[PDB]
Amino acid sequence: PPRKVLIISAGASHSVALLSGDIVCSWGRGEDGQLGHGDAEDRPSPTQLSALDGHQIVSVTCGADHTVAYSQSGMEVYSWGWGDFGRLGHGNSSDLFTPLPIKALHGIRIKQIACGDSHCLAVTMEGEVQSWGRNQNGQLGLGDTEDSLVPQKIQAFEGIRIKMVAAGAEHTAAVTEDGDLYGWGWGRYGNLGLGDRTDRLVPERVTSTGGEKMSMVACGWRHTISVSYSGALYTYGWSKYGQLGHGDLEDHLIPHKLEALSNSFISQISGGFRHTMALTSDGKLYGWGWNKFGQVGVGNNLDQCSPVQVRFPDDQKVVQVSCGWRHTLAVTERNNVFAWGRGTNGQLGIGESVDRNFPKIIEALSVDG
Template sequence: MAEEEVAAPIRRVLLISAGASHSVALLSGNVVCSWGRGEDGQLGHADAEDRTLPTHLSALDGHDIVSVTCGADHTTAYSDSRLEVYSWGWGDFGRLGHGNSSDLFTPQPIKALHGLRIRQIACGDSHCLAVTMEGQVQSWGRNQNGQLGLGTTEDSLVPQKIQAFQGESVKMVAAGAEHTAAVTEDGTLYGWGWGRYGNLGLGDRNDRSVPEKVSLSNSEKMVMVACGWRHTISVSSSGQLYTYGWSKYGQLGHGDFEDHLVPHKLEALSDKFISEVAGGWRHTMALTSDGKLYGWGWNKFGQVGVGDNVDHSSPLQVKFPHEQKVVQISCGWRHTLAVTERQNVFSWGRGTNGQLGHGESVDRNIPKIIESLSVDGSSGQQIESSKVDPSSGKTWVSPSERYAIVPNETVQGQTSVSVGGNGNDASVPETDVKRVRV
């Protein structure tokens, strides 16, 4: 496949989103770019190649995309004019919402969501949720711990409406590895799914298969919520930040490594007004109303962005060139993205698959500008163009074909090989072999 650089007009970065090891950006002019790990098709370029530079996702040209959201190894986008949600990438457990578990290497519309006016989409490790403009919630994908909120623990291959929110108007949702949180228009906080670390905020370590209200001691109204892998972050109407759940790496920010089973106010930032929060696999970022960014938690790859690779259990400020103010953030599993008011995009953390967008596979522990997406970039927004005709290549892979060669032990201790490709899912491993990467 030939790739070439194409001159692009100066475009503003409207949205950024980070997955496990890939990144996506929406630029003005409805241009979508993706980069990083591509093995599962999550970049949408009709192949399984990694990209170390932001690459124009031409398959979405002309679709009037207004939002993009990364799951761990899959991606979604929404077209406001077409009223379509598109998804692509790793398809196990039905996380793409197309009624099967096949991988998709180019964006495809989710039929069950056609015609819905979508306010927000949240993607966790293996499940997704969509909030409609009317405040209703649809969920789909993996559900072994009840994270879909449907009252069952059965996976859902297509979006289903969460009936428990009947009569409620949901403002936003957030998805972790196997748990989910939501905030309603009246400021009520909900949690459901996997609760082993107190990450539901309900005072215990039990799972919930339907949304349950989180009690707050001071009756504060919540306006924002985000999930890390096993922890949750919420922000009140007064700009105060609360965290709860797993804190083995200090990701709750309270100066210790203790789990919290209910929302716990982050005193270290109590004099700040928090305007945005994001949760990574084991780290957390918070943006203040005056454009300052703070990070804490697991920092093995420098994803906290403070110049070292040491875990931090309390918030530290992330520094940017010329003291630029930050206006948007997103956490991947081991990397972080930020947009400044000067329309520059920065990234830091793990770069093994090119997810930092710097044209290399190097880790960074301080913010580094992504040249091709930034007004101050020396390359003048020269965005890589992936010239692929989706009709000429394979756009999907069935699970049986993906895991076509599966060793089977024999009584003699030798290994035989079963070859799939017959259209069923018999060869798919029972265990999720790709769940955790170090």
């Protein structure tokens, strides 16, 4: 039996999966060390990350050109890839071509990890947040603009339990257990949701939320997506490529409900470089935004400023989706994994391949063919 695919994650030009039996595999661009195989070569097919065999990994998360993973039983976080600005969290700027433990996080109960371009954040089981990496625009939420090579606690969240965090190029977002939404970091395109285009050095609460509490948040490069308790979808920030999905190319400075999906309950969301994906509770995947390389997955190369359903063989329902910069990954109910978009770094995982504008199955990881 082909191992169940438990988690997928996409970076700028690479792809990572966690499979049952606790094995990690990676593919795509390898030049910065983001695949973790020791060498610097691109891999066009899923390749087992041997250094993590036996380490009981339960999650993996891609940044633009780096990757983070963690083990619950080992109480360890690992990172590898481009090391500049401290994004790997080891107290230095060195690139890593094989995983190493983030010593500062050893023994800490991790709930969730998010990775942006050059900064990362971890949420603990007690709802505290630690952040590290580039901080030139306050994206670490630490109250200044100095980069951090090691994780630091966000003191601004003292007394406020955090449920999940998200990170874009140079901005950050979070939702609390009580349903509050926050933004901070680089804010020039309205992507913090605070009603202006200025940065924040500490988390600031988003007050315009359509009267709704929020359960989920995700970040694209310069846009942000959230989901409410009623399953409504909100987008804000940059829409040069229509990635907000409102049927035009206008930016929004506060969360704006995507009315076209109002009859659906959204269960998962992902933000890409200039595109966006949302998954409904009945397993339908919608994509929109930039489609130059086919990354929307709708079988053409027209940009899309409104949500369009991504179709799969036999209409099999989708269970996970993750956006890269120029590609998209998805897992279905049948335990098939699909990829589409740009394929030049091997990130689609289907062997040497032309770009694809509709879903293509990754046979190496899938039950079907």
